[PDB]
Amino acid sequence: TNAFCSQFSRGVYAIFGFYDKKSVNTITSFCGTLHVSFITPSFPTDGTHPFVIQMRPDLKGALLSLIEYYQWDKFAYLYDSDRGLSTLQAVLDSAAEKKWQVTAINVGNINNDKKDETYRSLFQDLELKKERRVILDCERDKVND
Amino acid sequence: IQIGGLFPRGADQEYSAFRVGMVQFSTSEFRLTPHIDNLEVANSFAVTNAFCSQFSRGVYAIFGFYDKKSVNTITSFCGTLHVSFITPSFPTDGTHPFVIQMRPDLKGALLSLIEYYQWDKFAYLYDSDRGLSTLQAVLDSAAEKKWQVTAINVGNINNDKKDETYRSLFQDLELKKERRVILDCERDKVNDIVDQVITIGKHVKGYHYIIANLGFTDGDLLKIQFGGAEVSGFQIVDYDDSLVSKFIERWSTLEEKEYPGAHTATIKYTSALTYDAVQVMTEAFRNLRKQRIEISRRGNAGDCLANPAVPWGQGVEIERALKQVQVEGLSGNIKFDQNGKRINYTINIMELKTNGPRKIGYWSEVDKMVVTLTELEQKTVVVTTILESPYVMMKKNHEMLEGNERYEGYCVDLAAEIAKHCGFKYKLTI
Amino acid sequence: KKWQVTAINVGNINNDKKDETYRSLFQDLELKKERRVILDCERDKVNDIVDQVITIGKHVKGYHYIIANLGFTDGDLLKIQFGGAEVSGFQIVDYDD
Ligand SMILES: *[C@@H]1O[C@H](CO)[C@@H](O)[C@H](O)[C@H]1NC(C)=O
């Protein structure tokens, strides 16, 4: 908010930036209200929001197409809340429609104090249904983890 | 002592509960002098301007509402400026400072309820506007609890090959010849939802509905009352309590024009949370007075945009006071943790019956699910017969069998046919 | 017209009694094998009776109901719509106009 207000006071015509799912609503609302154009590499906002230009293409269609290509009726979906729940809603609705059995576990909230406990609980949660197919939707560090 | 007045334009009964809270809890020791602001809650900009306005006026604490879009602004700003925020609105996930959340967590109660009804497979409807938190909870628990959950977004049920695709889904879940559905949207919208469910599903019979809200008795259940469908829910306001009954009488006595929607047999749970919020703030300021801590601000608060931002030290003390407050209220026992979440709260489990809504028990953090129970067909045609082969005979193991299911023979099947044609329920007796 | 008519007064019933009297009534209609029914009621009572019918399961095929009021579309027919039982009535207000 302070950075955006600073840039507004400076009188810049356009603003380039990145945003977390926490600061996205503020950015879109402020750009919509003050008519300042925003260009971003970040995940596309979920909605019709004006004045915001998102350089990143949407992965949902590609993802669902790939799942449908590999012919998976059952898989594990691991996700973090950092980039938003849109894709989750998509794969869940489509899971309902195509009769997919999907296990969606939020890995977004995790403790570095105890990593081992949480990971053990996660994998033991997956091992009940013996999932051999997993979709990792995560920030890159978490993907590496 | 000035406080923040953030309110949605469509909030009336909660506004009335706020004013009633001000009048009832009014004391000669100190004046709360509430400054009311009407704004659009979904807009982040308007919330920012309202909060910065309240900060400009230099209010000590702030009361308001926040939509899932406006939440992070409030949490961040109150987090940086060390200002206390008290709200009836949905509890934030994770730990946040300076925010006091009046409504109890619904997750545990819902999980315990599903586990109590022993549902293996069910459908969960959700609206993307309210948020997926509870859905995320039940999905996280779904893996361990062996639950098969069909998650339907109420947002678009409209086409998808019209009825044909979604009907298979909706009537797939029939198990006991009973279909199981959890709603969790909002009261009015929930009525619309169940109606739409009956439309798209084409099957009107055998539904067990679970409304997930603290507002079970806060709306009219007459339309969903008889489909032949079971209805269960959660009630945060117990009318058996003396305080609540008295408050209900006085609430019902009030005039309609002065306070909007002021008199009704029931009260919106959010409104009751606003009232409870007024009481909690009163107790907090009183406790700040009794402990001789000076919370009065010397200078003007200034501009919220100012960098680096200047927090007030005594604000910490204010927060401490708000967290130390424990009182009795419409929501039951009111106590707070270090994170601001409600604790010791008691959420009533309700089932809708022929004579109307009743309480089957209560849920607590430590006690989990507790059934109250404590408690007859209308007409039963008595069929007499003697045990003889092969007319009426006892099944091989009738000891673990109960009722008429332990009698087999020509006369049994014959009785079943007769009673099927004449359409009466019967009991076989020797 | 040589009609055989069984006329029942549903008018006076206690709200506490509710479903029970209706159950008795419709069971007594089932034992007489009466598959044809005329409601003759305002939308409220029509809704109550229809709810009862759907609960006891008499809204299935083979039952013919005639709702006599000018309010045929005013009550809730959505719930008895998929039962398969033929429901006829009177509408004085046409949305086609
Ligand atoms: C609140 O919690 C305390 C914990 O010791 C308990 O003793 C008390 O009965 C609770 N109050 C209510 C109203 O449940």
Short mmCIF file of all heavy atoms in Angstrom, two decimals, chain B residues 241 326 328 332-335 343-346 362 364 366-367, ligand 1:
data_model
loop_
_atom_site.label_atom_id
_atom_site.label_comp_id
_atom_site.label_asym_id
_atom_site.label_seq_id
_atom_site.Cartn_x
_atom_site.Cartn_y
_atom_site.Cartn_z
N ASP B 241 -31.12 -20.21 28.09
CA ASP B 241 -30.43 -19.36 29.06
C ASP B 241 -31.27 -18.13 29.38
O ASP B 241 -31.98 -17.60 28.53
CB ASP B 241 -29.05 -18.95 28.53
CG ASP B 241 -28.14 -20.14 28.29
OD1 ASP B 241 -28.36 -21.19 28.92
OD2 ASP B 241 -27.21 -20.02 27.47
N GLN B 326 -13.04 -12.28 30.00
CA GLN B 326 -13.88 -13.47 29.99
C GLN B 326 -15.24 -13.14 30.59
O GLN B 326 -15.34 -12.79 31.76
CB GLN B 326 -13.23 -14.60 30.78
CG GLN B 326 -14.13 -15.81 30.96
CD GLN B 326 -13.50 -16.90 31.82
OE1 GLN B 326 -12.34 -16.80 32.20
NE2 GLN B 326 -14.27 -17.93 32.11
N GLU B 328 -19.90 -13.77 30.29
CA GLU B 328 -21.04 -14.55 29.81
C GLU B 328 -21.81 -13.74 28.77
O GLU B 328 -21.99 -12.53 28.92
CB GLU B 328 -21.96 -14.93 30.97
CG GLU B 328 -23.07 -15.89 30.61
CD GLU B 328 -22.57 -17.30 30.34
OE1 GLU B 328 -21.42 -17.61 30.73
OE2 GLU B 328 -23.32 -18.10 29.74
N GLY B 332 -22.76 -17.87 24.56
CA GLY B 332 -22.28 -18.77 25.59
C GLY B 332 -21.07 -18.17 26.28
O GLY B 332 -20.87 -16.96 26.23
N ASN B 333 -20.28 -19.01 26.93
CA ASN B 333 -19.07 -18.54 27.60
C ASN B 333 -18.09 -17.91 26.62
O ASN B 333 -17.71 -18.53 25.62
CB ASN B 333 -18.39 -19.69 28.35
CG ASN B 333 -17.28 -19.22 29.26
OD1 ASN B 333 -16.16 -18.95 28.82
ND2 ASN B 333 -17.57 -19.12 30.55
N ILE B 334 -17.69 -16.68 26.91
CA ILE B 334 -16.80 -15.93 26.03
C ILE B 334 -15.42 -15.77 26.68
O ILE B 334 -15.28 -15.08 27.69
CB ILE B 334 -17.36 -14.53 25.70
CG1 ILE B 334 -18.78 -14.65 25.13
CG2 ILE B 334 -16.45 -13.80 24.72
CD1 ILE B 334 -19.40 -13.32 24.79
N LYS B 335 -14.43 -16.42 26.08
CA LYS B 335 -13.05 -16.36 26.54
C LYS B 335 -12.15 -16.34 25.31
O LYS B 335 -12.51 -16.89 24.27
CB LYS B 335 -12.73 -17.57 27.41
CG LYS B 335 -11.41 -17.47 28.17
CD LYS B 335 -11.07 -18.78 28.88
CE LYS B 335 -12.22 -19.26 29.75
NZ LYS B 335 -11.87 -20.48 30.53
N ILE B 343 -12.41 -19.50 22.71
CA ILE B 343 -12.14 -20.74 23.44
C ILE B 343 -13.24 -21.02 24.46
O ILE B 343 -13.95 -20.11 24.87
CB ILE B 343 -10.77 -20.71 24.14
CG1 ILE B 343 -10.61 -19.41 24.94
CG2 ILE B 343 -9.65 -20.85 23.14
CD1 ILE B 343 -9.30 -19.30 25.66
N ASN B 344 -13.37 -22.29 24.84
CA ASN B 344 -14.43 -22.75 25.75
C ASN B 344 -15.84 -22.67 25.14
O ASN B 344 -16.82 -23.07 25.78
CB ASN B 344 -14.36 -22.04 27.11
CG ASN B 344 -15.23 -22.70 28.17
OD1 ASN B 344 -15.50 -23.90 28.08
ND2 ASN B 344 -15.69 -21.92 29.15
N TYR B 345 -15.93 -22.16 23.92
CA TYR B 345 -17.22 -21.98 23.26
C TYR B 345 -18.01 -23.28 23.15
O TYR B 345 -17.44 -24.36 23.00
CB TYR B 345 -17.05 -21.35 21.87
CG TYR B 345 -16.14 -22.12 20.94
CD1 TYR B 345 -16.61 -23.19 20.19
CD2 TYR B 345 -14.81 -21.76 20.79
CE1 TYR B 345 -15.78 -23.89 19.33
CE2 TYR B 345 -13.97 -22.45 19.93
CZ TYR B 345 -14.46 -23.51 19.21
OH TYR B 345 -13.62 -24.19 18.36
N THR B 346 -19.33 -23.16 23.25
CA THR B 346 -20.22 -24.31 23.18
C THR B 346 -21.16 -24.17 21.99
O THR B 346 -21.99 -23.26 21.96
CB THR B 346 -21.03 -24.47 24.47
OG1 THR B 346 -20.15 -24.71 25.57
CG2 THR B 346 -22.01 -25.63 24.35
N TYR B 362 -24.42 -30.87 22.55
CA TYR B 362 -23.49 -29.75 22.41
C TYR B 362 -22.07 -30.20 22.03
O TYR B 362 -21.69 -31.36 22.25
CB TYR B 362 -23.45 -28.91 23.69
CG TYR B 362 -22.61 -29.50 24.81
CD1 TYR B 362 -21.32 -29.06 25.05
CD2 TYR B 362 -23.12 -30.50 25.63
CE1 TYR B 362 -20.55 -29.59 26.06
CE2 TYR B 362 -22.36 -31.04 26.65
CZ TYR B 362 -21.08 -30.58 26.86
OH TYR B 362 -20.32 -31.12 27.88
N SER B 364 -17.88 -29.00 22.23
CA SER B 364 -16.86 -28.17 22.85
C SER B 364 -15.49 -28.60 22.34
O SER B 364 -15.36 -29.65 21.70
CB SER B 364 -16.92 -28.28 24.37
OG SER B 364 -15.91 -27.50 24.98
N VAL B 366 -12.72 -29.41 24.22
CA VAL B 366 -12.25 -30.55 25.01
C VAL B 366 -13.23 -31.73 25.02
O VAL B 366 -12.82 -32.89 25.07
CB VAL B 366 -11.92 -30.14 26.46
CG1 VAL B 366 -10.65 -29.30 26.49
CG2 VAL B 366 -13.09 -29.39 27.08
N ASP B 367 -14.53 -31.43 24.99
CA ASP B 367 -15.55 -32.46 25.13
C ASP B 367 -15.95 -33.10 23.80
O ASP B 367 -16.63 -34.12 23.78
CB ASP B 367 -16.79 -31.89 25.82
CG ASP B 367 -16.49 -31.31 27.19
OD1 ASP B 367 -15.45 -31.68 27.77
OD2 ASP B 367 -17.29 -30.49 27.68
C1 LIG D 1 -15.65 -22.62 30.41
O1 LIG D 1 -14.46 -23.40 30.52
C2 LIG D 1 -14.16 -23.82 31.86
C3 LIG D 1 -12.82 -24.53 31.81
O2 LIG D 1 -12.40 -24.93 33.10
C4 LIG D 1 -15.28 -24.71 32.38
O3 LIG D 1 -15.00 -25.09 33.72
C5 LIG D 1 -16.60 -23.95 32.32
O4 LIG D 1 -17.67 -24.81 32.70
C6 LIG D 1 -16.85 -23.43 30.90
N1 LIG D 1 -18.07 -22.65 30.85
C7 LIG D 1 -19.13 -22.99 30.11
C8 LIG D 1 -20.31 -22.07 30.18
O5 LIG D 1 -19.13 -24.00 29.41
#
